[PDB]
Amino acid sequence: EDPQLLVRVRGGQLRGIRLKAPGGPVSAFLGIPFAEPPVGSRRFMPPEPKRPWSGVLDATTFQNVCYQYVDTLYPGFEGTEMWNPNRELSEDCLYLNVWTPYPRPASPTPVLIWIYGGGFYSGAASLDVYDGRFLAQVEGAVLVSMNYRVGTFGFLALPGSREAPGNVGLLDQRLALQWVQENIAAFGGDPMSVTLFGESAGAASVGMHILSLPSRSLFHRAVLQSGTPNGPWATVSAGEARRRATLLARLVGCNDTELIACLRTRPAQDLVDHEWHVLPQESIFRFSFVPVVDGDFLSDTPEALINTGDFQDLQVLVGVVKDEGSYFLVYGVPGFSKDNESLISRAQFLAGVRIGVPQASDLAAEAVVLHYTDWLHPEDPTHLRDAMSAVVGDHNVVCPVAQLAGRLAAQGARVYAYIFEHRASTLTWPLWMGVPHGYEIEFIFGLPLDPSLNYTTEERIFAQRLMKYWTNFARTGDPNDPPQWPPYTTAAQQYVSLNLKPLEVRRGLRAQTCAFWNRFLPKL
Amino acid sequence: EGREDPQLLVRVRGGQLRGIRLKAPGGPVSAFLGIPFAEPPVGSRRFMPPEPKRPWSGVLDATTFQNVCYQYVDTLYPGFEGTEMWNPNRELSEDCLYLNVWTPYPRPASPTPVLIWIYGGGFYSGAASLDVYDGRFLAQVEGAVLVSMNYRVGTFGFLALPGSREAPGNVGLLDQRLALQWVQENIAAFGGDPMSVTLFGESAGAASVGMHILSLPSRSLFHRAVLQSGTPNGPWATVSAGEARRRATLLARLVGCNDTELIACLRTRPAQDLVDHEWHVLPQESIFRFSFVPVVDGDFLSDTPEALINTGDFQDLQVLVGVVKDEGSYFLVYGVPGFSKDNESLISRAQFLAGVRIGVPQASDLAAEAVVLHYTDWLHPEDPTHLRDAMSAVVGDHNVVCPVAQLAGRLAAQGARVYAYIFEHRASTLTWPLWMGVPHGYEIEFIFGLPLDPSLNYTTEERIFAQRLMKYWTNFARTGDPNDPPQWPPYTTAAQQYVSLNLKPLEVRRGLRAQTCAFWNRFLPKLLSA
Numbered sequence A: 001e002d003p004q005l006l007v008r009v010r011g012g013q014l015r016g017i018r019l020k021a022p023g024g025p026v027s028a029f030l031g032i033p034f035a036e037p038p039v040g041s042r043r044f045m046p047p048e049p050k051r052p053w054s055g056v057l058d059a060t061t062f063q064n065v066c067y068q069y070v071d072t073l074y075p076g077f078e079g080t081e082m083w084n085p086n087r088e089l090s091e092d093c094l095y096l097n098v099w100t101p102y103p104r105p106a107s108p109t110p111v112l113i114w115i116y117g118g119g120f121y122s123g124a125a126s127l128d129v130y131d132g133r134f135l136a137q138v139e140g141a142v143l144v145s146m147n148y149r150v151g152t153f154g155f156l157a158l159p160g161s162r163e164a165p166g167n168v169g170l171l172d173q174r175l176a177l178q179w180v181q182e183n184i185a186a187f188g189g190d191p192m193s194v195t196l197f198g199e200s201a202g203a204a205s206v207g208m209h210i211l212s213l214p215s216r217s218l219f220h221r222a223v224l225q226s227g228t229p230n231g232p233w234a235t236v237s238a239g240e241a242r243r244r245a246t247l248l249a250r251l252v253g254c255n256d257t258e259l260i261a262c263l264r265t266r267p268a269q270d271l272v273d274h275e276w277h278v279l280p281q282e283s284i285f286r287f288s289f290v291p292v293v294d295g296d297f298l299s300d301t302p303e304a305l306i307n308t309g310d311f312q313d314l315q316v317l318v319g320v321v322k323d324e325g326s327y328f329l330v331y332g333v334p335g336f337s338k339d340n341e342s343l344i345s346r347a348q349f350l351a352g353v354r355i356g357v358p359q360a361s362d363l364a365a366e367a368v369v370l371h372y373t374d375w376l377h378p379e380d381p382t383h384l385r386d387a388m389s390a391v392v393g394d395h396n397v398v399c400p401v402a403q404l405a406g407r408l409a410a411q412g413a414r415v416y417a418y419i420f421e422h423r424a425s426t427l428t429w430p431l432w433m434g435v436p437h438g439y440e441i442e443f444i445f446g447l448p449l450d451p452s453l454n455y456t457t458e459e460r461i462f463a464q465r466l467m468k469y470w471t472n473f474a475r476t477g478d479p480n481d482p483p484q485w486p487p488y489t490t491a492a493q494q495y496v497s498l499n500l501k502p503l504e505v506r507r508g509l510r511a512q513t514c515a516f517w518n519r520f521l522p523k524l
Numbered sequence B: 001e002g003r004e005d006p007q008l009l010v011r012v013r014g015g016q017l018r019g020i021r022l023k024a025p026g027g028p029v030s031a032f033l034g035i036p037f038a039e040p041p042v043g044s045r046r047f048m049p050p051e052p053k054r055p056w057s058g059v060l061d062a063t064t065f066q067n068v069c070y071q072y073v074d075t076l077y078p079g080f081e082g083t084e085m086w087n088p089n090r091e092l093s094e095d096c097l098y099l100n101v102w103t104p105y106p107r108p109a110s111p112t113p114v115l116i117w118i119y120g121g122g123f124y125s126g127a128a129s130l131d132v133y134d135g136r137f138l139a140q141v142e143g144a145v146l147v148s149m150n151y152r153v154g155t156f157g158f159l160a161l162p163g164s165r166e167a168p169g170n171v172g173l174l175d176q177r178l179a180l181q182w183v184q185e186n187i188a189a190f191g192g193d194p195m196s197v198t199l200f201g202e203s204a205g206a207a208s209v210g211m212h213i214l215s216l217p218s219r220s221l222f223h224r225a226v227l228q229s230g231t232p233n234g235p236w237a238t239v240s241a242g243e244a245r246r247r248a249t250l251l252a253r254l255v256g257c258n259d260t261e262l263i264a265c266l267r268t269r270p271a272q273d274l275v276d277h278e279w280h281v282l283p284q285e286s287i288f289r290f291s292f293v294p295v296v297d298g299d300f301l302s303d304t305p306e307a308l309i310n311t312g313d314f315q316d317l318q319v320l321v322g323v324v325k326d327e328g329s330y331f332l333v334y335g336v337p338g339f340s341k342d343n344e345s346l347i348s349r350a351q352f353l354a355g356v357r358i359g360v361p362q363a364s365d366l367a368a369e370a371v372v373l374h375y376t377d378w379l380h381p382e383d384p385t386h387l388r389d390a391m392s393a394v395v396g397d398h399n400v401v402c403p404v405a406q407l408a409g410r411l412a413a414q415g416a417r418v419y420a421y422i423f424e425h426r427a428s429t430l431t432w433p434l435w436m437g438v439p440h441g442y443e444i445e446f447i448f449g450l451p452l453d454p455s456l457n458y459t460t461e462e463r464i465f466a467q468r469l470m471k472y473w474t475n476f477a478r479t480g481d482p483n484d485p486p487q488w489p490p491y492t493t494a495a496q497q498y499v500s501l502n503l504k505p506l507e508v509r510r511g512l513r514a515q516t517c518a519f520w521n522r523f524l525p526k527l528l529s530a
Ligand SMILES: O/N=C/c1cccc[n+]1CCCCCCC[n+]1ccccc1/C=N/O
Pocket: A069, A070, A071, A072, A080, A083, A121, A151, A272, A275, A276, A284, A327, A328, A331, A438
């Protein structure tokens, strides 16, 4: 009975498992319950704290993945399968994971808390690319990750109602942070130094924690990778959420209270079966159930809140990958597939824009088209394909990120910004997709330190650098090891390219183009 | 005759002429200056089509420039070469319909290609007798026959009550057309070949050339065309029949005046009175528009130029078009607040916004916003040097560069052989400040070869450069191809190739401000609609 693997938290005793990292052992505590299972009458409801338990709770294995749709687009294809659930689905899914140095830190160690993405309809803390062992071993970090409800279970709201308030998926994450304040010290972690990091929808989630006062006392620093609380996809108005919830209720055969009672009687797989039809669409740009501007968790729209916020004592690292848009396209944009080079026509490009910017009027659509057409090669299929990617990535990620960076910096935050440009040698998506979002994650978590995953030796050195930047940032609010990475500011607009070459400092994050999205389009 | 130089006596349809032997650097040329081609459009003929000149008796002396057409005289910088060189250099008069011919000396024995110059000046000014339009060098060095004509400007040339008989519009254009006819009938007397006539002009001159292309009765009078920094399409070169009616009616009121009675009252106004009011007809801080320009009358112009270049068949046409490096800079010193010849004209963002309202007076608030956002440098949105240069680009692109790109594109798509250039050499003798770069009009002295005159103090390289240009233009006049048999490829819609003209050899470039001209030529219009 290894004492390094026995920990007492407020709810009782836990036994973890000693795991192997390339450089030595780590202690892992997997599948720790942090809430009462959100089932039966608790579906759609805020999470309640986990009741205390007797004896020694087995925390040696990942718990169930929160009930969700599973992507079937390319059955057996690595590129897709790696994001799919790797444990059983279940509404009973509120568990977090902790990795620590073995033996557990002498003194309080900075804590990083990961929050996965997945568009608010999918994701899981148990995916291999979120494995915390490398950060724990090589950098001595205490790493935490939590499951949170997605889809209808997490974000279906009847705003103003008592039994389906909206944002419960974000309350899930908040309860895991609270759990960290209360228990992490028992693992050798410092509750006084907590850094949130997340990607895509996890990044937006981190954002929403920044913008929601009750979360602010639970972390000190934040990293948003390829996602933001602002922008087209991450939030929905109270009105529009009510509409979607009602449409979905109707789609499954169902006064708020009665409606919600009827939904609660539905088998999980029924809700998922109809999730997507609430917003008929050709691709995956919008999802029906995402966080709602409830005037509670989010007192106002993220736009309103970031423009007027005071961010004096906040440090933030944010960044994008080289090809934010490419991933989206293979999911229902005609002309695009993983299996050919996706050289598209002009006509296809125009229709692509109606899909990627679903909210756009005819005029707005044309402005986009005319901006992104290369007038020297108006009909070159290669240009059109790359442009389609750019439109979609700029509108959804790159410009929302540039705008967040700018507002935080203008309003007191210390901000660092990056563009990630290395394409994993092991990517199974085609070359034309470049560096799609999500494929920086495995480097940050240090997977290339595992020789059995067959990354190049430079890729290993690269991963070591990133783990340093991220953990330096968690330690100190500054990614530089104690050329330099300069703070992003509104004046100079400096960010850095992360790739195999040494840090390069650049200025202006798609500045002209983001002025188009952030200043002009709105007026239009 | 008897004792006079036998090479200077020539007969044209209207009578006998005595020209003058002039010295050019490489030897003598024959000049015939001030030949009347119309009845003086004075008195009851004001605002009317030109009538062909009635034959005279005796030997008309053709040894000096004739009157300059009545016009506003620029008084922005008294004494300043940079403004003065454009100012009238002969007496102002309504009696001003004369043309000029330069020919080799002795006159060529076989028929020689004819170049006809049409000056610019916003349709409110200009004269064929300015020094920078001196035909002597082209005649002496290239053996060309060069012809230039005065045409009516301002109200005299363009005041229109569309539909009236007494003031139908476009008579200034009709003056040019009459001179083209006079060349068809008479140029052979000078050794010129009426079967080889290339029109060339700059600014309003170019827009003029473009309108002769667009107007069928002019098309039989010439074979090839050069448009320097101007086009029949674009925001300044034409007005609608309704708008022209409105302006003439307003001008009539400003001076104290049924169309017949109105025009009769105008005809009693002293020329200087019309001139003193023409600019009030359209209140503006700066010279981007003029009140009296070619009108779309459904006659001379059967539709808008925009429509005609979209629907036109131009298979037979060879055309040379281009722009100078800084088309906008000139405009700014004429009343955009913040801008001056005497300082570096660093401006604020607010001055830039305000400049954009003035430079694009037709823009809604949204359109103006789009323009500002497009031309803003988002890395340094507040930098006064970039803002100054962006004000110049906005006004240059909207008024000349983009109308020219659109012109080259339409013509090329529709059968024409097009050659395109951007001229980037700033004369060493220029008296405008450096910040203005190469303002429009400052390629002209090189095309006309002034730097071969050693007394003008151009550098040796400028002299070699001017020869290059004279060769390009006259090869084009001769053969439809500026190349001498590095190459100047035609401009096409696939490749969009054009050349830089400067002291270095030809360099081929692709796309004439392509992104930005997509903004002005495709997007802005639609923003107009909403
Ligand atoms: O809840 N309904 C889900 C559903 C059902 C039937 C058809 C389509 N959907 C949407 C999403 C499909 C899977 C899309 C997931 C794409 N993806 C997977 C992994 C990593 C990234 C991404 C997309 N990045 O843009």
